[PDB]
């Protein structure tokens, strides 16, 4: 999550955009696919249908 830098990852901004009115409207249009990850309590978890592994632990 947000690694290595926000300018590259942009997880939080993308999550907020998806949760915003514009994101919901775009999803309804259907051109943009549904969100693929959820921001848990300090961690990012991809959905099982995203077809990707979970991010490696930061140690």
């Amino acid at each position: 999550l947000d690694y290595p830098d926000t300018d590259d990852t942009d997880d939080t901004e993308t999550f907020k955009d998806y949760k915003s009115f514009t994101g919901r409207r775009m999803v309804d249009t259907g051109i943009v696919d549904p969100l693929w990850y959820d921001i848990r309590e300090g961690k990012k978890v991809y959905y099982d249908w995203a077809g990707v592994n979970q991010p490696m632990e930061d140690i």
Partner: protein, 254 residues
């Protein structure tokens, strides 16, 4: 005997279909009812008294969601396309998690353009006004024949199952959404069941897809019209007569 019984049943079904078409045409001959504001947000349509509103022209305002539509297979003038079926949202809260609505049949769409990513436009998902004829989707639900299967999880449909469509839409008013399905219609076309013009288009398909049905198209029930049923009944009755005569000759064995 079996084929004679089948032909008699086909003739009875032809008469029933003719009566149904007549009554539906008479019902559609009435003016259109514009539902706005509170009425639009809470449509009067309900499974308790759906028969009252069946095949009635209603102008309703709502927010369609093309992103999660259904493509029920269908054949229209030789094109093995789909009948676009969208969850037409009527009222939603600020968050949008809880919402209610109905099912709107936009019309026939070609198979090539059926995918959302295969279209050259961004579908509008704002409030829009649609004039539709209320229908129960009898032929859509009864199509598919034997071995037909549908996978709502994969969003693949072979026949129009009202309960599965309502579950896919996810509207709170499950009973209301499952009661009936709206079909986008044009009120400026002949009200003749035998017009032979089912979708409002020209020979060049100038209109942009999906092509809304006409009143004649809504009245038409593919593969179950009275003339087709009468032709099938006549063929079955001839086959009967022939087999019965042959069996009688064999029995006589003069």
């Amino acid at each position: 005997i079996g084929t004679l019984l089948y032909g008699a049943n086909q003739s009875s079904k032809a008469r029933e279909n003719k009566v149904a078409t007549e009554t539906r045409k008479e019902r559609m001959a009435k003016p259109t009812i514009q539902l706005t504001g509170a009425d639009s947000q809470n449509p009067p349509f309900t499974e308790k008294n759906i028969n009252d509103w069946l095949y009635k022209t209603v102008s309703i305002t709502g927010r369609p969601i093309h992103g999660k539509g259904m493509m029920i297979p269908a054949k229209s003038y030789g094109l093995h396309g789909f009948e676009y079926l969208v969850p037409f949202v009527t009222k939603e809260n600020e968050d949008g998690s809880v919402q209610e609505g109905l099912i709107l049949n936009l019309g026939f769409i070609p198979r090539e353009y059926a995918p959302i990513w295969a279209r050259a436009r961004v579908e509008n998902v704002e409030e829009q006004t649609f004039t539709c004829v209320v229908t129960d989707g009898k032929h859509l639900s009864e199509q598919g024949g034997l071995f037909a299967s549908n996978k709502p999880c994969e969003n693949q449909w072979e026949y129009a199952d009202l309960d599965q469509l309502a579950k896919h839409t996810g509207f709170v008013n499950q009973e209301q959404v499952r009661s009936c399905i709206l079909e986008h219609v044009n009120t400026e076309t002949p009200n003749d069941e035998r017009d032979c013009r089912h979708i409002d288009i020209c020979s060049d398909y100038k209109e942009d897809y999906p092509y809304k049905f006409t009143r004649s198209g809504v009245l038409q029930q593919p593969g179950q019209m009275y003339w087709d049923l009468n032709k099938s009944a006549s063929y079955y009755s001839l086959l009967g007569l022939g087999c019965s005569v042959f069996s009688a000759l064999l029995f006589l064995a003069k």
